[PDB]
Amino acid sequence: QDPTLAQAVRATIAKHREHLLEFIRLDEPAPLNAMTLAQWSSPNVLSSLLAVYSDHIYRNQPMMIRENKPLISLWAQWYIGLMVPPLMLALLTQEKALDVSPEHFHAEFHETGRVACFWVDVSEDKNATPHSPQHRMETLISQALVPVVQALEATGEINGKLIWSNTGYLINWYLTEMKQLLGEATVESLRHALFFEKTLTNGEDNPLWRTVVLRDGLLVRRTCCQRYRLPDVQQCGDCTL
Ligand code: FES
Q: Are 89 and 16 in contact (CB under 8 A)?
A: yes
What amino acid is encoded at 68 in this protein?
Answer: N
Q: How many residues does the chain have?
A: 241
187's enclosing H/E stretch is: helix 184-195
Q: Which residues contact 205 (CB under 8 A, 6 or more apart)?
A: 198, 199
Residue type, 193: A
Q: Are 165 and 211 in contact (CB under 8 A)?
A: yes
> Alpha-carbon distance 55 to 73, whole Å?
15
Name the method of structure determination. Answer: X-ray
What is the C-alpha separation between 70 and 55, in angstroms, rounded?
A: 14
Neighbours of 103 (CB within 10 A): 13
Determine the atom of ligand 1 nearest the C-alpha atom of 169.
Answer: 1
Other residues' Cβ atoms within 10 Å of the Cβ of residue 154? 12
Mapping DSSP to helix (H, G, I), strand (E, B) and coil, where does residue 205 land? strand
Instruction: Give me the domains of the chain, ranges plus CATH numbers.
Output: 5-229 (1.10.510)
Rounded to whole angstroms, the Cα distance separating 176 from 184 reads 10
Closest of 187, 162, 160, 192 to residue 174, by C-alpha: 187
The answer to whether the CB of 224 is under 6 A from ligand 1 is: yes
Residues 6+ apart with CB under 8 A from 227: 70, 73, 74, 77, 233, 234, 235, 236
100, 45, 72, 234: which is closest to 166 by C-alpha? 72
- Determine the residue type at 89: L
* Strand spans (E) along the chain: 24-26, 105-109, 115-120, 212-215, 218-221
CA–CA distance, 6 with 60 (Å, rounded to integer) = 42
One-character DSSP codes across 20-53:
GGGSEEES-PPPTT-B-HHHHTSHHHHHHHHHHH
225 CB within 6 A, ligand 1 = yes
- Give the list of residues 6+ apart from residue 87 with CB closer than 8 angstroms, or none: 98, 100, 140, 144
Distance CA 144, CA 125 (A): 13
Q: From the DSSP assignment, how many helices (H) and strands (E) are in the chain?
A: 9, 5
Amino acid at 230: L
Q: Is 74 in the pocket of ligand 1 (CB under 6 A)?
A: no
Contact (Cβ atoms closer than 8 angstroms) between residue 53 and residue 75 = yes
Nearest CA to 139 out of 88, 81, 76 is that of 88
CA 74, 76, 80, 82 dihedral sign is positive
Comparing CA positions, the residue from 51, 70, 63, 36 lying closest to residue 235 is 70
Distance CA 70, CA 66 (A): 9
Kindly compute the dihedral angle of the four CA atoms of residues 161, 165, 168, 170, in this order, to the nearest 10 degrees.
-130
Candidate from 71, 234, 239 with most ligand 1 atoms within 8 A of CB, to mutate: 239
Ligand 1 contact via 235 beta carbon (within 6 Å): yes
Residues 174 and 91: beta-carbon distance below 8 Å = no
Distance CA 21, CA 17 (A): 8
User: Is the distance from CB of 198 to CB of 209 less than 8 angstroms?
Assistant: yes
| Residue 62 neighbours by CB under 8 Å, 6+ apart | none
